[PDB]
Amino acid sequence: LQKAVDEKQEGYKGLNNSHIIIFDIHSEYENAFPNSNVLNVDTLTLPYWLLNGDELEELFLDTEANDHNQRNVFRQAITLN
Amino acid sequence: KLLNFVDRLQSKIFDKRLDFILGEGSKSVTFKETLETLISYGKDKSNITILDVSGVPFEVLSICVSLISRLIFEFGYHSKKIKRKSNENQDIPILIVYEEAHKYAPKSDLSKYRTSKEAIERIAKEGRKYGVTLLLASQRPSEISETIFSQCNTFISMRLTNPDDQNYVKRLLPDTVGDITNLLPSLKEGEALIMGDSISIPSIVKIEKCTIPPSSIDIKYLDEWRKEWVDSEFDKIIEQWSKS
Amino acid sequence: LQKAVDEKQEGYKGLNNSHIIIFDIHSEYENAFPNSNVLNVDTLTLPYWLLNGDELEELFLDTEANDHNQRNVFRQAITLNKKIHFQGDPATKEIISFHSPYYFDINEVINYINNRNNERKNKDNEHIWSDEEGNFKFDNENAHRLFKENVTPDGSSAGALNGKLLNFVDRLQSKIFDKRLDFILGEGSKSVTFKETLETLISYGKDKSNITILDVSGVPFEVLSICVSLISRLIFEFGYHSKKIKRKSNENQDIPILIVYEEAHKYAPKSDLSKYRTSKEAIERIAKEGRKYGVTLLLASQRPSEISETIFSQCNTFISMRLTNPDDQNYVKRLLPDTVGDITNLLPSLKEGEALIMGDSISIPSIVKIEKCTIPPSSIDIKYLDEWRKEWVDSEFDKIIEQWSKS
Amino acid sequence: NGKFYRGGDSLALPPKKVEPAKLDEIISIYSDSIDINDRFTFSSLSLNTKVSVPVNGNRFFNKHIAIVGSTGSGKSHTVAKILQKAVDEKQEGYKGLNNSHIIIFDIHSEYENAFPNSNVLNVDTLTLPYWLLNGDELEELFLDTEANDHNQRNVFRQAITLNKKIHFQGDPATKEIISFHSPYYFDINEVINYINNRNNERKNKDNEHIWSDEEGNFKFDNENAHRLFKENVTPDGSSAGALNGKLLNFVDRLQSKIFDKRLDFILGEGSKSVTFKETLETLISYGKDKSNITILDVSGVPFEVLSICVSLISRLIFEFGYHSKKIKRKSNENQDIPILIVYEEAHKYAPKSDLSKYRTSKEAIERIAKEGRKYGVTLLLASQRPSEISETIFSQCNTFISMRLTNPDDQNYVKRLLPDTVGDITNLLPSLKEGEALIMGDSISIPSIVKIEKCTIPPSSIDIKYLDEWRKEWVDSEFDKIIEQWSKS
Amino acid sequence: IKRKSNENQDIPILIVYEEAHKYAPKSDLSKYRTSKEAIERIAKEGRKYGVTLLLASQRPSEISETIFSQCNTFISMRLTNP
DNA sequence: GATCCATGCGCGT
DNA sequence: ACGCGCATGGATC
Ligand SMILES: Nc1ncnc2c1ncn2[C@@H]1O[C@H](COP(=O)(O)OP(=O)(O)NP(=O)(O)O)[C@@H](O)[C@H]1O
Numbered sequence A: 001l002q003k004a005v006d007e008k009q010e011g012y013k014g015l016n017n018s019h020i021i022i023f024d025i026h027s028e029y030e031n032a033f034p035n036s037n038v039l040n041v042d043t044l045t046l047p048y049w050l051l052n053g054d055e056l057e058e059l060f061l062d063t064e065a066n067d068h069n070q071r072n073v074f075r076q077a078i079t080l081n
Numbered sequence B: 001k002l003l004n005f006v007d008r009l010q011s012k013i014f015d016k017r018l019d020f021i022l023g024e025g026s027k028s029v030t031f032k033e034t035l036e037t038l039i040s041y042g043k044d045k046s047n048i049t050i051l052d053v054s055g056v057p058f059e060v061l062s063i064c065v066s067l068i069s070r071l072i073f074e075f076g077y078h079s080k081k082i083k084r085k086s087n088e089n090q091d092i093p094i095l096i097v098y099e100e101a102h103k104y105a106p107k108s109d110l111s112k113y114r115t116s117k118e119a120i121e122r123i124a125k126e127g128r129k130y131g132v133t134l135l136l137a138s139q140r141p142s143e144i145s146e147t148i149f150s151q152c153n154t155f156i157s158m159r160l161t162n163p164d165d166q167n168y169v170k171r172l173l174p175d176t177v178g179d180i181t182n183l184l185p186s187l188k189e190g191e192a193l194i195m196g197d198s199i200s201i202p203s204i205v206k207i208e209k210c211t212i213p214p215s216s217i218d219i220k221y222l223d224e225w226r227k228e229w230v231d232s233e234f235d236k237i238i239e240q241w242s243k244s
Numbered sequence C: 001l002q003k004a005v006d007e008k009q010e011g012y013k014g015l016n017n018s019h020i021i022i023f024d025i026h027s028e029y030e031n032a033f034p035n036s037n038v039l040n041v042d043t044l045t046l047p048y049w050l051l052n053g054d055e056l057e058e059l060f061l062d063t064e065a066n067d068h069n070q071r072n073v074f075r076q077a078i079t080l081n082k083k084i085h086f087q088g089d090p091a092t093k094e095i096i097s098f099h100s101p102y103y104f105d106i107n108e109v110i111n112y113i114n115n116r117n118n119e120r121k122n123k124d125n126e127h128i129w130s131d132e133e134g135n136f137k138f139d140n141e142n143a144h145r146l147f148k149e150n151v152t153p154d155g156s157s158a159g160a161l162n163g164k165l166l167n168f169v170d171r172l173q174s175k176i177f178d179k180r181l182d183f184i185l186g187e188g189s190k191s192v193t194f195k196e197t198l199e200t201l202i203s204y205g206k207d208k209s210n211i212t213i214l215d216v217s218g219v220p221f222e223v224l225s226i227c228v229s230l231i232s233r234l235i236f237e238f239g240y241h242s243k244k245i246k247r248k249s250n251e252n253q254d255i256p257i258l259i260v261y262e263e264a265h266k267y268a269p270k271s272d273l274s275k276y277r278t279s280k281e282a283i284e285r286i287a288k289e290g291r292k293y294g295v296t297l298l299l300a301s302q303r304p305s306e307i308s309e310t311i312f313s314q315c316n317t318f319i320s321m322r323l324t325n326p327d328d329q330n331y332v333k334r335l336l337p338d339t340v341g342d343i344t345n346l347l348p349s350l351k352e353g354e355a356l357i358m359g360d361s362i363s364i365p366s367i368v369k370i371e372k373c374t375i376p377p378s379s380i381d382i383k384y385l386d387e388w389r390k391e392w393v394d395s396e397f398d399k400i401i402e403q404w405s406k407s
Numbered sequence D: 001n002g003k004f005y006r007g008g009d010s011l012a013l014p015p016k017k018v019e020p021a022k023l024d025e026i027i028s029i030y031s032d033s034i035d036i037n038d039r040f041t042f043s044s045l046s047l048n049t050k051v052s053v054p055v056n057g058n059r060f061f062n063k064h065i066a067i068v069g070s071t072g073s074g075k076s077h078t079v080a081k082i083l084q085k086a087v088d089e090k091q092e093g094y095k096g097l098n099n100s101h102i103i104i105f106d107i108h109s110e111y112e113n114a115f116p117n118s119n120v121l122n123v124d125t126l127t128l129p130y131w132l133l134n135g136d137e138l139e140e141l142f143l144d145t146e147a148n149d150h151n152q153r154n155v156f157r158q159a160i161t162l163n164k165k166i167h168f169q170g171d172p173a174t175k176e177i178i179s180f181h182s183p184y185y186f187d188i189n190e191v192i193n194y195i196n197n198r199n200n201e202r203k204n205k206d207n208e209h210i211w212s213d214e215e216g217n218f219k220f221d222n223e224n225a226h227r228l229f230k231e232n233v234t235p236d237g238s239s240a241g242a243l244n245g246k247l248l249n250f251v252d253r254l255q256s257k258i259f260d261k262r263l264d265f266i267l268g269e270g271s272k273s274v275t276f277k278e279t280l281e282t283l284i285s286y287g288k289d290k291s292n293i294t295i296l297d298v299s300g301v302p303f304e305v306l307s308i309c310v311s312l313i314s315r316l317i318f319e320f321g322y323h324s325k326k327i328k329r330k331s332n333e334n335q336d337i338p339i340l341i342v343y344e345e346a347h348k349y350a351p352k353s354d355l356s357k358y359r360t361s362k363e364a365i366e367r368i369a370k371e372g373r374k375y376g377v378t379l380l381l382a383s384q385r386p387s388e389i390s391e392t393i394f395s396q397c398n399t400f401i402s403m404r405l406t407n408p409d410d411q412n413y414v415k416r417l418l419p420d421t422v423g424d425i426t427n428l429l430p431s432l433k434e435g436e437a438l439i440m441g442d443s444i445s446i447p448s449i450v451k452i453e454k455c456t457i458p459p460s461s462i463d464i465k466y467l468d469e470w471r472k473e474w475v476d477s478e479f480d481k482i483i484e485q486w487s488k489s
Numbered sequence E: 001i002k003r004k005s006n007e008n009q010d011i012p013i014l015i016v017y018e019e020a021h022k023y024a025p026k027s028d029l030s031k032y033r034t035s036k037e038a039i040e041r042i043a044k045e046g047r048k049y050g051v052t053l054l055l056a057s058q059r060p061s062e063i064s065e066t067i068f069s070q071c072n073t074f075i076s077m078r079l080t081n082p
Numbered sequence F: 001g002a003t004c005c006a007t008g009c010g011c012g013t
Numbered sequence G: 001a002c003g004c005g006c007a008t009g010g011a012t013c
């Protein structure tokens, strides 16, 4: 990823067109790329409403109980909203 | 009939761990500003966007990986809609790096990891033509599913020591090297093996040393265990826990 | 753990900064570490109000029998009693929920259900009550006055929940009044401070020790999953809130904690049964995220087959002794990060005290002999033939039975 | 210098002259690995008769013993021969029986002949009180409903815990700590009387149940709940109680099992007059007739009564030792007693199958398999197939006496437990005739095929001469004697 | 009955099970269970009670191994399957 | 297929 | 009108 960034088309000066997303758990790629953008839990703002039906179910509902009555009002509340 | 459900949700909305997904800032944020944040197109442009998911709880870790992977993919899916209409030469290609890809994409059709399974597998199957490609970096290849691992064509096989890991890799490798069974666990530091369309033949390579290396802030357990029994530190922990 | 607490730098004498908490169920490490805080059933005073809503429905409640009316009055009593006893800002007061871990009086919760067991309403069908201050509507503003026992209902006709909680109350009086749950429901558990609970677990109280044995041998089985999960959550959020002040303080002052789970397959089984789901989730929480926050597992289990695949995979150093069960060997060899020559028959043939260590903390996977423990966990192996060889001794059955009687 | 040290790692530089080993050297192989006072010899080598093979008798018994082999191979004679040498294993200085304590679960009436001076306890004379149960088996016995019985479950423990407090005749300090699992005497007929009373509850407007007995009306609370144990009470209330008409089927299932005379040994009238002290003197033989050998006849009883009989005794002998350690742990003396439990044909109650009818007997022998080494309660597993016993119990035995095995899976089960250095001794397993066996484990120096010593006093398990009994007359079997004992059984 | 008279078992009974795969097979379904354990009890503990079995079957690999292990006497006709 | 619980309807004190 | 007792029925195991 460092090599894929520092190569340019030599006709300019500045950032190139590379676009990289890293899902690091060990919190280690800040020291690799100091001039990058880091999105930890404090600064990242992911919208809950951009989740689909399956991601909204896992975020809120429980699979172990699996009670049919809990799920139905959640669809009626969210789809109407 | 809905008090535990109303109680279960309220515990998630006011959870300080889920502030990044259920806080008041998530309500006021816009759909456009999220995508500037995800590929660094906001006030500060950057080629690398690091998603530090260390603080993300593991129950919602598969949810947020799936949400971001879906948002990047249909960013590239609708990118082609302009290119067939305006016929412009420019393009926005995106590469996603999934460190520890075995947990995001396991070999299980379980509910708890299904959401992050299909988001990665959609990118691995359709994202070639939309400019959304993935890089898989896992220490355990044998838990990555075959229907996503085989969609990769370039394979950088480093030193692999678990015999269950060697047999999974050797089956899905596009080409073979002489005595690959002994070569893989005997690779030194930085020694790799690359095959696929990008390379000509499978060659044992030596990756260049990182001048600015990726280092993690790991708690040196033995180093702090040599020190004095800390006394003032304990009273600072509880009072912030009490206040937050 | 003996060489962890004896490993010091050349600047002092006494105790170092090692913090080890052992979940001992077979009662083995009291003699192993004689300079430690062994916490028994009677010694432990674990507060019931630090549980979330999942453990509260596993400590007092049971399986559902279309008893949502009885379940709702239980949750609405606790989630209201948590608000009244809260002495903070009103902004935090509204976010208080059933799963939120603040103090509530369990005896006042009984009195709320006891009053709701006999409620009377007027024609307007409003639950009207009588107290020493005056007659008051039953509503969310005045429902906190039902926690007192000396309240008399006043109404023309019987209320909605009148006589519908009689079988709810006596089950609860079988719990706080049960003497096998004294640690998690006793009067000391009411008056224990949240700070006092954490300094007991990590041994930060008056008697400070590097190693804390959590003797859970006498803890009952149906409650053991609640207490393992509660302590594991409390230790993890201690380490979680360690790092939240570490960013602000920006100083090298850390409290690293290592948790030893013996018979770790019991609290973390691979089966999806609802009995051990609380303790599995707390151990998995530290297995996945505890590396960042300074809380580290030590999974020790004599039968590693039922340890869950996700939790056991987070381990990076493996100390494999002799394993006779083939199901254990196929489990171990598959998730073992490295391998050695002729390892299939090596696992049964490992000697007494001989270990195979591999990981990323040791470069060469080596077969080692663990240095003999000079302060042992006492060898519990009764010499048998020579003790049979002697005379027929008169076993004192009276004191054996009377200790059996009190259990 | 006549002392044998194990280990093949010693290198002999060639050439070294070779002689056949002398007699005393052949003794030295199987003897010097054990100290002089820990030798427990009960067998000889098959290749050489004049050598004896002693095992580490201290290590032979504390680590569990598993004896397996095909039918008729000689397991029962070898099990008996181990115990006869264990009883005779006395120290010098005294005449009388020694401190051996062996309990045999005998299911074919064999060990009566092998041990004549022994105590034999069949079901009809064995009295195992129902109040000795620790709540876990108090639930599985009486309750036939498993899932949604929370009110029926609650009234069951509340009656028993309150009735255990009543029959307490001592100081009130240990009256309080009586619980549902605490082993105190309670009367089962009063417990039914309480539950049948609670099925006839009546309450007033205040929702508090009021009763009426021969002394007067009383409120039902904690102190006056003891007065529902008598039948001669009448309810005085305007409305039906909280449990009115909900315990009718509960009493029916509870009564039908007390009067079930398969469970007459546990739920009979003899459990009233038999105390905690007399039961432990019965199962261990510390009573008037003190014996090293205890035999229980569960031969032709049905499975369910056999399953409770195995599960009760195995835990109650363990929980004897589970509470025999903490008295020694708090006093620090050496006067313990070691107990060995012989499980003949453990497939009948501790198999590899995961059925729920095999559940409560597996854990009782599981708990002796791992934690029983800590409290002096050891187990001796006899079975026909090694692969039919559960691996949680059967792999915990560190001493193996294997007879003839012809099954490939049974041969494979011995094979992978053993290493490959001495794994070639398994190939002589199906060629083993009556008598000889292989002893392996930590109690012996080398695994070897050995010839078990013949029982001079054998168990009553003589092989039937099938052909010699067929050459005779058509004998007239007295069918009335067999049938009228079949019907009584 | 004879043990009370201190005698051995008088009459011996042999039960011939022709084509035991129909009722005591290798398979572990519930419909074969109650006929399986009926012949297990003769194979396991029937030696000392005078009740022995004769197992006639078309293949050694379809009969349950637990009955088949206790059969010490083995007769084998032509067997084409390896 | 129990248990446990809610809700409705008709009736006497 | 409030109450108690009898139903029919629902959910969950
Ligand atoms: N050491 C021995 N020497 C000679 N014969 C022996 C010896 N041990 C056993 N036998 C013979 O074995 C037969 C009885 O076998 P037994 O001791 O009942 O083995 P078993 O495996 O327990 N039978 P089973 O219960 O069906 O498995 C008799 O014919 C004995 O003579």
Ligand SMILES: [Mg+2]
Residues within 6 Å of the ligand: D075, D076, D344, D461
């Ligand atoms: Mg036998």
